[PDB]
From a paper:
The surface of mature, infectious flaviviruses is composed of an icosahedral shell of 90 flat-lying envelope (E) protein dimers, the main target of humoral immunity. In contrast to their mature counterparts, immature virions possess 60 protruding spike-like trimers of precursor membrane (prM)-E complexes (prM3E3). The pr domain of prM binds to E, obscuring the fusion peptide and thereby preventing unproductive fusion within the already infected cell. When immature virions reach the low-pH environment of the trans-Golgi network (TGN), the trimeric prM3E3 spikes rearrange into the flat-lying conformation, characteristic of the mature virus.
Numbering used by the authors:
A (entry chain F), B (entry chain D), C (entry chain B): 92 to 163
D (entry chain A), E (entry chain E), F (entry chain C): 1 to 494
The structure:
Amino acid sequence: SVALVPHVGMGLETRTETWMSSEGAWKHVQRIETWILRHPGFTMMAAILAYTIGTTHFQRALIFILLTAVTP
Amino acid sequence: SVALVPHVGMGLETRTETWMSSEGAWKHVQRIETWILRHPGFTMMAAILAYTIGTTHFQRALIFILLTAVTP
Amino acid sequence: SVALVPHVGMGLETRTETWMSSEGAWKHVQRIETWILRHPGFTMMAAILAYTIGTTHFQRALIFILLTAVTP
Amino acid sequence: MRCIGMSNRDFVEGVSGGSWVDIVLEHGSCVTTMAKNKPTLDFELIKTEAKQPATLRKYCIEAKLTNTTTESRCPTQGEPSLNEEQDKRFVCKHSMVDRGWGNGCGLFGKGGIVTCAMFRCKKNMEGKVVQPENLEYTIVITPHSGEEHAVGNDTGKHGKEIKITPQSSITEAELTGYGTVTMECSPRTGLDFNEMVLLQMENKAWLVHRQWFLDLPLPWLPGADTQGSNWIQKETLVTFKNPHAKKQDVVVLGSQEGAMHTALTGATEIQMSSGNLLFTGHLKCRLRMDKLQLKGMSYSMCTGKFKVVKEIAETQHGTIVIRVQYEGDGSPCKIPFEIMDLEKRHVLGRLITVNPIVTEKDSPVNIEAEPPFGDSYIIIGVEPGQLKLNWFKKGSSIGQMFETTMRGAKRMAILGDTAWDFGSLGGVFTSIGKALHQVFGAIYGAAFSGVSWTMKILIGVIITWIGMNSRSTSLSVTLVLVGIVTLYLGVMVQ
Amino acid sequence: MRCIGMSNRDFVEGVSGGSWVDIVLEHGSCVTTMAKNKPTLDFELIKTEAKQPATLRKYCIEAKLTNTTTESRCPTQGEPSLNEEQDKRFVCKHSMVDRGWGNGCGLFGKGGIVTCAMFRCKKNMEGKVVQPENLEYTIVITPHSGEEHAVGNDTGKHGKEIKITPQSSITEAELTGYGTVTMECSPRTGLDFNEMVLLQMENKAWLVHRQWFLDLPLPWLPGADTQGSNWIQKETLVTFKNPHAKKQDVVVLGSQEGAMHTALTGATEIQMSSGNLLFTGHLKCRLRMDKLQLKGMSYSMCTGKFKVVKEIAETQHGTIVIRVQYEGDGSPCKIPFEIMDLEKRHVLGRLITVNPIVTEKDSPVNIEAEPPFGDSYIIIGVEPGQLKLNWFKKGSSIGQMFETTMRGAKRMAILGDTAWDFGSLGGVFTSIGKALHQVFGAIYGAAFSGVSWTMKILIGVIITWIGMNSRSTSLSVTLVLVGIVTLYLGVMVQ
Amino acid sequence: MRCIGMSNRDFVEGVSGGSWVDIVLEHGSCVTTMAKNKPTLDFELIKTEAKQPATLRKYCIEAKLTNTTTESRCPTQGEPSLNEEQDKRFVCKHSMVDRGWGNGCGLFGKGGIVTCAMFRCKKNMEGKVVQPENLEYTIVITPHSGEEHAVGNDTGKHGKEIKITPQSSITEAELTGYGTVTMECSPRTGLDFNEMVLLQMENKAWLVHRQWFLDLPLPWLPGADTQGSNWIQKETLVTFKNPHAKKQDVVVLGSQEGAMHTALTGATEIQMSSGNLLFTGHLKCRLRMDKLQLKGMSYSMCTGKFKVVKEIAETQHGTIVIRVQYEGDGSPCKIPFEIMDLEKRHVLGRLITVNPIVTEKDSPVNIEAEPPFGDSYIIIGVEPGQLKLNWFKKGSSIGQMFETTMRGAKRMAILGDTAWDFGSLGGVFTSIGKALHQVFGAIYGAAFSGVSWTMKILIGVIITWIGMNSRSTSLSVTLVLVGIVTLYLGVMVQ
Ligand SMILES: *[C@@H]1O[C@H](CO)[C@@H](O)[C@H](O)[C@H]1NC(C)=O
Ligand SMILES: *[C@@H]1O[C@H](CO)[C@@H](O)[C@H](O)[C@H]1NC(C)=O
Ligand SMILES: *[C@@H]1O[C@H](CO)[C@@H](O)[C@H](O)[C@H]1NC(C)=O
Ligand SMILES: *[C@@H]1O[C@H](CO)[C@@H](O)[C@H](O)[C@H]1NC(C)=O
Ligand SMILES: *[C@@H]1O[C@H](CO)[C@@H](O)[C@H](O)[C@H]1NC(C)=O
Ligand SMILES: *[C@@H]1O[C@H](CO)[C@@H](O)[C@H](O)[C@H]1NC(C)=O
């Protein structure tokens, strides 16, 4: 749907506040947090998968947060 | 027949578009794609036949695409 | 177009000859031979290209005839 | 007798387990079935009637474009719209033209332009799918009765007509004086119409493949359509040109009837004028001759004389037909027909026409028989009045072996796994042979699915070369024989 | 005066090369310019009047399905057709359902089924585009004169309202007694509308990107459509549910007002009721005050005293405003306003309201001045009657420098390469800086096309880690700088 | 001004040695020539009249068979002869059928059969050829004068129509007040019609190759034939089917109009209703402006005011067009048009419309000029009354460089060695370059004779792989260059 694709990043931002600039800016972080809280099993599975696939102590956390972010 | 051997590449191409310029350009590509998706067995057979005849990792794919494109 | 895709190989061939059984059998062969006679430069170019790309004394002629028949 | 004029003629000499024998009757061919103590018959599949055809898809071969409308739009102002775009009858296309102050616009750039034209189909070809259950195979059964004109008579009135229908797999054919025969045909198995369409176009009909008929790049409408105004994929018969990027002109292509004809190089031509008449394919049936009796078996040997009405004529397979007229009394009798060598040690040749009899007086009867290779003597009469006809039949044993091997190979190439059941009397050997051939034919159809005969030859040569280059055992000779089979299938096609 | 009540306010103290200065006026902010011997001015872009809007595309947000019809087809007999399929107003879809003897057909399998429903959009949204030549930027210019309620008066009637239009870029503004000023702005370059779309929906308007607007998954029709019946991509609002493959039920989705509102997070809201009123964006241009003269320079220093009307109030940027009323004789005069320290060795602070005068006797005059950090004394009157007003301005020089650096960084993040023209007085240094920042911003936009602020922070942290891990010289510090500026653009967004 | 509306527009900016310049005028494109002291001109090859067409060969697309006769011969008796065998109108074909006693014969075997049918062509197409001296290239020359209706006016009535004829190569064009210009073409060099054929079919004409037209597998007759009854190669439109080897029936194929339209995927459509109107091709030839003079160069600079009639609009190449009307007195004057930077120090943008003048009062004047990238101030009036309009042109210097490089590459790929003469001012460098390009194009046409664009891409990537695999010096880089030019030629097709 249209709601899936947001208007952020288009470069048309100015000094004036945008539409739904207060709650729409942090809504992704909040939805990811509540999704992780509702699904802790998938979170731990992605964590151990990133831990066993990274093996660099930096790519582990990167792949972990990517797997928890790309999953709505 | 008459429909075969089109008037392509004859060197008379100019700045203006030719007869059947939109559909005639990708006509062969589209018909080959249709013939491949309709008969994938021959595609895999030609791939297996070319993998054992190329022996250079480049002639294999070349002979494969040539076999899948030569068949009308 | 529709004439580009024939009805050959469909497995419905019976004892009775099919439509265009006399001229349709050697139609592609004779059209390729006439296209060769009308365009010998491309034939010799494909021949030398396949000779330089084969380096095995067998796949040269195969690639040559494939490149000659694949071009309508 | 009717099978004699046929060139591609087959001879079955097998009955076992209840005189049942599996034969495959072809439209262009005919099968001569003979036994030891049972009369010989000639089965020819002369027609296939397909009733209640269901329209699958109608394509347009020649059309026209009326109400040519065009409207441009200024650049950076969206696309142009038309009231004819909402009607799918109007084929429409959008493109970009050069818009500036000379075209009534304010900006200079690529402006959208829509071109619509009412697509009216001038002539259309129809696609009909027929269920394998509504078929009707017309089979003529000519018994070797030795009539004056039964030899090669394709007009009929000499044999019996059987309408093999899937509704009644079991059927009986009652002959004149030979009794009744059983013919259990399997029309659903051989030449299945579930993937075949009866494409009709300008009084010319073809038996096309369904998968090949569905993906034809032509404007089509479903068979359920009764209006005929809506067409799917109208862009295949309609082109849009943008000369100099100034205006868009829409043009209707010519009649695709010639393109269709040159696109049907593998489809078989049939007759669809008042009824769907398929004249191609095959029909495999088991034949049972338990109730079939020899006409005139109770007749004794007539001690009269015979006269040669028609000279001995050798057919393409080597069987000779001789027309002899009985002169003596007692017309119902058994003709003492035999074929011996020059020294006349014993009967060396065989008789195609089993138990030749004389029906009525002064009626020339025909007798077909396969003489041996070389010189032979045909004996027609009894010792007092005897016709010792000398006949030299060309050929050899190895020659006939090669001919019958090539005929069997061609039959296997044409019928696939159905030719292995031709003349099969049962058993584990023929069963496993047919099973292996069916598996190999399925693999071949998966590999060689829609390739041409030239491509078949090329792939066979490549496979043979790879097999000859294969140094490992148990894998080279298999590839060589596969390549030879592919070469044979390529040289034996259409 | 009008610029004092503004939270986001800028101060320009540069004029050279012909008394010109480049300033960037924004809608939410305002610019307070001043010179050495020229009167200070306050420029505020209050409104942008976009005229002659051309609708390029109208998306549907809520529709209704009428005349819902459907029909199924027997398996292996093609697709089912409907008379409504030829009408693009009817959205349709083909699928397969279980067909057998219980449904009315004879074959058992997957039969084709189609269902058509008339797509009648009840409410929709409109997307328009305006040419950059049709803009009208309304800019208010309020000179510091010192009326009774001039400070923070956003109603108007205090300055001049100039309508910058690209039809006449060069234009003069005639003030009351301050002479004339020159300001050509060319709204084409600032906030170009060639890639932006004004989107209107339920009396709520947004300034969306053109590419983001064209790729909206909603039923749309071109802006040139006047009937509104034919829609494109109607399958986004109309779905077809086939439970258990029995029947295909068509149904329209809910209203997309909320989905669009949550889809317009990065879009800036504007007002479109009777005219296109843009209240966002920026406008960078050159201002020439060579013809600008000081109002009241011919007046001498009056000897009368002053009385404080309103107490000294410090603004958000450090400037103070004092409202004083003249009591002596000879009201038209130059107020001896200054800011000194305790010992009064010389003036330490600067005066914002250049040349403060009293226009009328018994009229409160507002004086704005920027005192130094720490303690300061504001002298207003002559030595007989003098106002000794103490003021303690909190902060330090390092704090002011950090605040100015943060403001400049925010301006460069909001305007991009346009902020480098803010307060520019020419020269090769600022020119090469603007060029380098323009190339860097082009590369940034090519890399960060439409990423979110969270993904922006993520890529910034990634680049910072790569730079800290890269051990090469002249290549890691650049990566750390890119990571820092990406983190800053992430935390300073929306 | 007519060249402004064209998207594919070229700009020639060179004259030397008598002000001669070689330009290639195309039908889809237009040429804009300009000098430093001579007025700019716009050349558009709008039409090519081909007179005196001689029919070379008429092909048949739809025929009809009548008087279908057949005759079967007994085996071992030769081929059956009919009275229609000598008649060249009747198409015949010999075959073998099964002959025996059932067919009226005495022997059994393969008997010869002949089937003749009168070949009556109902619909056919005609190929014509025209001598290269019978061409008449219509070239419109619209000088930049400033008429409000001259910008992109394809209707004409504003320029001069020149009929370039190979009999009269050197021709003169007399403009209104700009003087005379010389054009020498002799079209015998380009567009060799000795190897091209105008193929007309159902009021649709194409420009095809002679070798491809003479190799069409269709029933044809020479152009000298009048009766039209004799057709050569009739078997390409008729099929002789021998079902079951019983009888040989001949059936005429459908209309080959659709198959022909398919066979013309690279042919260019033209107009042939009453005269052969070629709207494709090119004409490279020389233009001499030595006799050409600037109109109104002796006029002074008028001091009056100007008003903007039409706003500034940028073309696809970047040249802006401004329509402004003069207000003051003294109508015959010279418009002080200039394009300066933000600082207004020196002119940067060049004027496409050189020497803009005001012809009559109350008449809008069009002025085209190429502004620099970024912001540019267009000054139209004198210091007191001046239209200082700022315009922002997007792009960069490297952007325009890549754009013009791609334009030149496309022109080369389209014109062969002819594009090297575009804007050629003479010298040894361009001469040897054109010679090398002609040799390379000859070798290319020898190698890439009639291959499609897909085959072009395939051969290009193959040559690129071979060049990357080659390790020898001076052989890898040339092979990579051949591969990449083949890739570009395959990409830019149709
Ligand atoms: C199309 O043209 C015909 C003939 O000019 C006319 O009768 C008809 O009204 C037009 N419109 C439609 C929709 O057929
Ligand atoms: C072309 O010139 C003619 C001259 O009469 C004018 O009527 C017409 O409007 C012009 N076309 C344009 C400006 O597109
Ligand atoms: C839909 O139905 C209504 C009433 O049931 C009718 O008025 C309308 O014409 C119909 N729409 C069609 C047939 O397109
Ligand atoms: C603002 O200016 C208006 C017009 O001069 C005046 O009526 C008003 O009192 C001033 N102050 C406020 C707070 O509106
Ligand atoms: C063809 O048949 C028609 C039928 O009447 C006849 O008039 C004509 O003479 C015949 N032509 C030939 C060449 O036999
Ligand atoms: C076929 O039989 C019919 C029976 O009436 C006869 O008239 C006809 O002559 C026979 N055909 C041949 C070729 O003998």
